[PDB]
Design a protein around this ligand. Structure first.
Ligand SMILES: [Mg+2]
Ligand SMILES: [Mg+2]
Ligand SMILES: [Mg+2]
Lengths: 136, 113, 149, 202, 132
RNA sequence: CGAAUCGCCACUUCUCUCGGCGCCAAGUACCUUCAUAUUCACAAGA
RNA sequence: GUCAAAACUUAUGGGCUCACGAACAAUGGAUGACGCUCAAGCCCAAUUAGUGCCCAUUAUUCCUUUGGUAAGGGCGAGAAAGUGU
RNA sequence: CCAAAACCAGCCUCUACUGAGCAAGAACGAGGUCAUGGUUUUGGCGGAAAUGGGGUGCCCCCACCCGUCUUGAAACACGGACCAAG
């Protein structure tokens, strides 16, 4: 069967991996934690450390951008196109927010996720901060 | 949209089976709850009063009004979009047949029809 | 390389980022008076030495020298025009073109960084004939075992 | 399958700055893998730091040392303790983050040849120490404090280096090809591209 | 008519789709709908496979790059319009006009290829530092 | 078993004091499929 | 600096410092802990740099409640001369 | 019912003098926002969906046993096992 291994050597001319599928148009953040002092946290205003934002004037760029804490439950539940798009029925779930304002002089921003808090399990975890609504 | 949806429970009702969950104002200098330390249970106060035009309004959007017999239904005939009859628990299933096929004919709402 | 009057420092991190400029006069050991007629915004000012990166260039010059003397002397060398020639300078203007670039220029680059990365392989595949590569070199020798069988 | 680990190379980093920066990233969910914790530095002469540690080791429950503070002597176990002291070690958020850190003495063969190794410029020794001030390399003090494997690691570190270096010139013909292949790629049909490459510095 | 649609988004401009089925697709903005309505970007589908279709201005990134497509008649794009022959026919009539409008430009060969491009936030990539 | 995750590589993955590529044609030529998935909505795809 | 929100360890600020250093003798162990040493120390000044940020039951503003023996207006379903429902 | 975008309003944020400086004044432009007001639009979901409540767990966070006399109680101060009736 090393017979096949010799055949494989001639045919490979030397390629490369290429990312040709679905793009991500969201930045990868982290839910750094709830806004808080020494006395405790405001669970209704999350902090979001976007990757490569390091600066406060970048963080300002992201204000208003919609933000997503995507995760999953253990059963399927109604999603945005449960009937129109059966393909889309995961037990994957998502919690949306808006970047609200920059937080601190670093790249962190404040995200309120709707009226609700985002769950504390979300912390340390991939928030996905989208590039929209666009401005630019 | 309510201020507080939780009950204002009595302090330490959870430890003592006999204590009802119903509120008693805490007393004793050293009560953590009346001294209103931040990690403690809240006390009821005027500030938790519900918004006053949404007050008393059941999620149906009706204010409940007690009903006992078929004549009461006409107390709600002209204000049937404001009040909803809730038939008293003790009217017979007999009489409720009569309240109900009449609360239907009049367009008055019933909470428990 | 030593900092002294006439040394051609590169400003690093300040509002005048990339810009260079001759060290007109030392103040004390942690400051200097930078100057440079060639840029609009390099009028003489007090850069901190922490902020500047000395360049290998350095016009000969005298401390507290007047500016019009400098728009002279550096012109007689083109220490600046000579500086931009260096890869160390081009790298700074290069990153300063990518950051300054519009989205279509970044297409217009990726097409080249693939046009070249493609021909890097095309050159290599052709040169693949001459070892070594895991795909070709491993195989030529790999057959050595096959020929023995 | 491997998770998105990033293997920080801790050589010649300040102990507590690297421990502080790493301890933060673990909270932000990074799954770091510290290596060469033997090579972490500390400010001061080794004697300053042996005495700091021996004052640490001096602390035990009299009632029952068995359950007392535990005085790990591995530079890596010392770095884990240093990094658990910098994160919420009693909440699960931090007990979790601490298990996302894997310290090693040296750089272990599973972790070598896995990917590039990161560095923490804010925790660099040259970035931190005043250069002429004395400094304690960590695995060096802890050899005097009870770590028994200080020479086992050096024998291992010698081997990965002599081995990595042998492979660095095993591949010199290869890297030299792409250097040559890539330089002549500019001369290829990429014409207008050659000007879009000149701008931008390529 | 009324339009608050921003100056950065003008007809014939190339425009990244940030959301929806066609993420990362460069797409010429054919026209804004008769009221301050959503843009009708088109691929052209001849290139990146984006059909004529509506998109809200908030969900695209209007690149500085454009095409002088005043020449193209996008008039057949009206709200009442919003795969059937009447529509398949509409884009065919349009993309061919839109596609030639791209051709007229010097550096019109890249913009054909520039529209075959797909945007992607690759790791280490910083759009906020980007200009477009 | 539906899941969260969203760059790869023997050009980094040695040491001691702009790594390459990938990002929509295996290539700079736009040949060429994409719609009705009907303007966001977990990428409906890996 | 981490714990801990914030200087992702800011300053394109000054000095000082090698061993300690950071308002009101005996169970092992306390700058709060770690750790820090071109400080994560001290004095000084600063705020993006010779071209700031974080956290209150506080302030302001908004919504709601309650009180006023507070100020006014009014008299599809409602419009009661009313302390209080 | 969930969303998203828009519009209007509101709201908020972002010269002069002096000898390059200030103790200094607006403007243009743009952004943000409904946990602000009014204007719909557009999609998504529709035996179930949806909002609310309830229950159980977790997560992050906060949180010293109450009554008591006392200047001072978490007190190494007193009374306090449970429940019912009183
Ligand atoms: Mg998915
Ligand atoms: Mg922090
Ligand atoms: Mg006493």
């Amino acid at each position: 069967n090393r017979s096949k291994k010799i055949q494989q050597l001639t045919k490979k001319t030397s390629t490369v991996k290429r990312n040709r599928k679905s793009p991500r148009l969201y930045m990868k953040a982290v839910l750094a934690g709830y806004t808080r002092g020494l006395h405790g946290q405001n669970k209704n205003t999350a902090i979001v450390r976007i990757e490569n934002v390091n600066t406060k004037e970048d963080a300002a760029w992201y204000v208003g951008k919609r933000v997503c804490y995507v995760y999953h439950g253990y059963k399927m539940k109604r999603c945005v196109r449960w009937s129109k798009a059966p393909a889309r029925r995961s037990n994957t779930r998502a919690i949306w927010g808006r970047v609200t304002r920059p937080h601190g002089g670093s790249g962190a921003v404040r995200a309120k996720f709707n009226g609700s808090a985002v769950p504390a399990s979300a912390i340390g975890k991939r928030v996905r901060v989208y590039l929209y609504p666009s401005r630019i | 949209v309510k201020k507080r949806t939780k009950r204002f429970t009595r302090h330490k009702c959870e430890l003592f089976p006999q204590l009802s969950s119903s509120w008693r104002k805490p007393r004793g200098e050293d009560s953590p709850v009346r001294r209103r330390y931040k990690g403690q249970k809240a006390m009821p106060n005027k500030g938790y009063g519900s918004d006053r035009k949404t007050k008393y309004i059941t999620p149906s959007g009706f204010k409940n009004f007690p009903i006992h017999n078929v004549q009461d239904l006409y107390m709600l005939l002209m204000q049937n979009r404001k009040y909803a009859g809730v038939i008293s628990h003790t009217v017979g299933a007999k009489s409720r047949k009569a309240i109900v096929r009449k609360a239907h004919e009049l367009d008055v709402r019933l909470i428990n029809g | 390389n030593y900092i002294r009057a006439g040394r051609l420092v590169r400003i690093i991190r300040g509002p005048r980022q990339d810009r260079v400029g001759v060290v007109v006069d030392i103040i004390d050991g942690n400051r200097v008076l930078v100057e440079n007629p060639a840029d609009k915004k390099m009028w003489r000012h007090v850069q901190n030495l922490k902020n500047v990166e000395p360049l290998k260039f350095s016009v000969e010059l005298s401390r507290n020298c007047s500016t019009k003397t400098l728009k002279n002397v550096l012109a007689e060398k083109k220490i600046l025009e000579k500086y931009a020639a260096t890869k160390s300078a081009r790298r700074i203007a290069a990153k300063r073109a990518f950051a300054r670039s519009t989205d279509f220029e970044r297409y217009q680059l990726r097409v080249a960084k693939r046009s070249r990365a493609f021909w890097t392989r095309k050159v290599f595949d052709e040169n693949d004939k001459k070892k070594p590569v895991s795909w070709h070199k491993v195989a030529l020798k790999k057959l050595q075992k096959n020929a023995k069988k | 399958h491997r998770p998105e680990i990033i293997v920080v190379d801790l050589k010649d980093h300040v102990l507590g700055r690297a421990a502080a920066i790493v301890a933060k990233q673990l909270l932000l969910g990074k799954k770091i893998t510290a290596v060469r914790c033997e090579q972490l530095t500390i400010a001061g002469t080794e004697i300053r730091n042996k005495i700091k540690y021996l004052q640490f080791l001096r602390k035990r429950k009299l009632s029952n040392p068995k359950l007392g503070p535990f005085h790990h002597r591995s530079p890596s176990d010392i770095f884990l303790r240093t990094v658990r002291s910098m994160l919420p070690r009693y909440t699960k958020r931090g007990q979790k983050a601490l298990r996302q850190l894997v310290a090693y003495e040296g750089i272990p063969t599973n972790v070598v040849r896995t990917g590039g190794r990161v560095v923490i410029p804010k925790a660099q020794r040259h970035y931190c120490y005043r250069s002429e001030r004395p400094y304690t390399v960590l695995g060096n003090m802890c050899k005097h404090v009870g770590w028994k494997y200080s020479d086992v690691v050096k024998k291992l570190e010698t081997a990965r280096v002599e081995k990595a270096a042998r492979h660095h010139k095993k591949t010199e013909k290869l890297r030299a090809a792409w250097k040559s292949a890539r330089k002549e790629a500019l001369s290829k049909v990429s014409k207008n591209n050659l000007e879009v490459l000149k701008k931008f510095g390529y | 008519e009324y339009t608050t649609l921003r100056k950065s988004c003008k007809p014939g401009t190339i425009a990244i789709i940030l959301a929806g089925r066609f993420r990362g697709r460069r797409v010429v903005i054919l026209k804004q709908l008769p009221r301050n309505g959503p843009l009708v970007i088109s691929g052209p589908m001849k290139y990146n496979g984006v059909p004529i279709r509506r998109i809200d201005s908030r969900y695209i990134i209007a690149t500085s790059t454009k095409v002088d497509i005043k020449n193209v008649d996008v008039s057949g794009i009206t709200p009442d319009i919003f795969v059937s022959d009447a529509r398949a026919q509409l884009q065919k009539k349009v993309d061919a006009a839109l596609i030639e409008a791209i051709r007229k430009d010097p550096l019109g060969k890249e913009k054909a290829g520039y529209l075959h491009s797909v945007f992607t936030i690759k790791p280490g990539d910083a759009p906020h530092r980007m200009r477009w």
